[PDB]
Amino acid sequence: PPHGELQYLGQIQHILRCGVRKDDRTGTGTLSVFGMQARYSLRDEFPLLTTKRVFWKGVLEELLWFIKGSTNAKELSSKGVKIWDANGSRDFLDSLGFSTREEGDLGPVYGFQWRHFGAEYRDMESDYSGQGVDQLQKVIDTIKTNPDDRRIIMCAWNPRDLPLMALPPCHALCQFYVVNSELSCQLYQRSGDMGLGVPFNIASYALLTYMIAHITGLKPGDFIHTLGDAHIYLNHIEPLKIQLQREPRPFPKLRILRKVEKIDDFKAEDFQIEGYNPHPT
Template sequence: MGRGEKAYLDLCNHILTNGTKRDDRTDTGTYSVFGHQMRFNLEDGFPLLTTKRVPFRLVASELLWFIKGDTNIRYLLENNNNIWNEWAFKNWIESDEYKGPNMDDFGNRIQVDPEFNKIYEEQMEIFKKNILEDDVFAEKYGDLGSVYGKQWRAWKTSQNEVIDQLKEVIDSIRHNPNSRRHIVSAWNPEDIPTMALPPCHTLFQFYVADGKLSCQLYQRSADVFLGVPFNIASYALLTHLIAHETGLKVGEFVHTMGDAHIYSNHIEQVKTQMERDIRQLPQLLLNENKRSIFDFELTDFELKGYDPHPTIKAPIAV
């Protein structure tokens, strides 16, 4: 029990002990190592961390957003998912149409200035309301550009054709399981300038053996405290869904990282988490009446036996 979660906690300890202190794009600062791999046996249980609560509903709704090929945060907000808000909000406050209070460097200012944090939250609520209620505003400021969903479902070629990578990889797994080309890439160099955030989880590959489906993710940039627990659960869920559709059992999720880092303002939270004991992993149940991953909705997932330690809050670096 907990071998995968122990590997995660070992990574946290490795970074705190051996990581290099580095500046970063967000001006927050990180402790970082380069090149790390963790393995999760999905037959042991669903790898949702137990040393802190990870909100499965947010993981699942974000994954469904990717699967739908959507790039606008309206769907996420409709499902009470706020994890991409800051990047879309940044587009609005940097536009000529924004007339509100100065929001420069809001990601860092909200951590040290309670009064500014109140103003920020007011502006964020205005922004979210506009996304949900104003179609024109949502189209202009809710869209994050050619991020994950676009690349997974509608990769545009130089011949102006469109490739549905996700659909093709499912067909490949079903009809040519021994192929070494079960790959989906989110890293499209031509589209990087149009993305709110270039993809951190850049490429994933599937592998079929002994009637089991395994998945390996390469993640160029890994926010170990906030992002990685989501990434583990998201790709584990994706593996379950595709195994379900193709009539396979689940095998392993292999998580390979480039720059694995802990932000300098997450250190105490990480230490708190490392002091906690690992608990029994939950079990994932899928709606057996749904076969195609493109038909699944949030109500088609059930997580049984999830009894984690409490949530540990930390600021997100934008």
């Protein structure tokens, strides 16, 4: 079967041949296409792009970070992952109108939405136990008791909380599917930076399927990446052109060195990526 990465390179290709010019908040300018969908098999392999090294440590840590229900950039920073510190800075907070908010506090972002959807938000350092709808755990429960369910969904898009956020969620929602004891997941992404972003997202949710599959006794199935506004910044054009020529190398494999019973007991040491030979950067 053709390499799984071709699906992704094929999209960069499309955006370059049919992508119309569009601007972002700043006005940097990009080439955009609206409405894309890619399929990545998770059966005995892991969709960790090879044409360009992906920040694996970042993916793993950020996911464990969401799982906890944390909305503090600091807790993720103190792990070597700074991808969220920029939004937790002292100025950025006031820039949007959050002066009373302590530095680091991102607001009711991802994590919060997954474990306490609909709960009155207050501050990053607070207890929310038994508050709001715990979607993540509900999903696990359903997959275990009624795998045929067609309404197994995790929604991070909360219209009423959007204001109180450092940045709207790029991942509006994800849906799970089970058939022949095989767990699949589809992610809806409102906007994606094909250049240096989508690759990290593909792995984030690919990992999330793996974890859930592990605690539900199912086998990883398919990961469907659905995009809204898929764009490439005008400057990443050249860099990607030489990347489209690089031949994709066999995807690595993710092994779970331990046996976990609950989604919360997952440790960063519990995982291991073998056969990951990315292209030089």
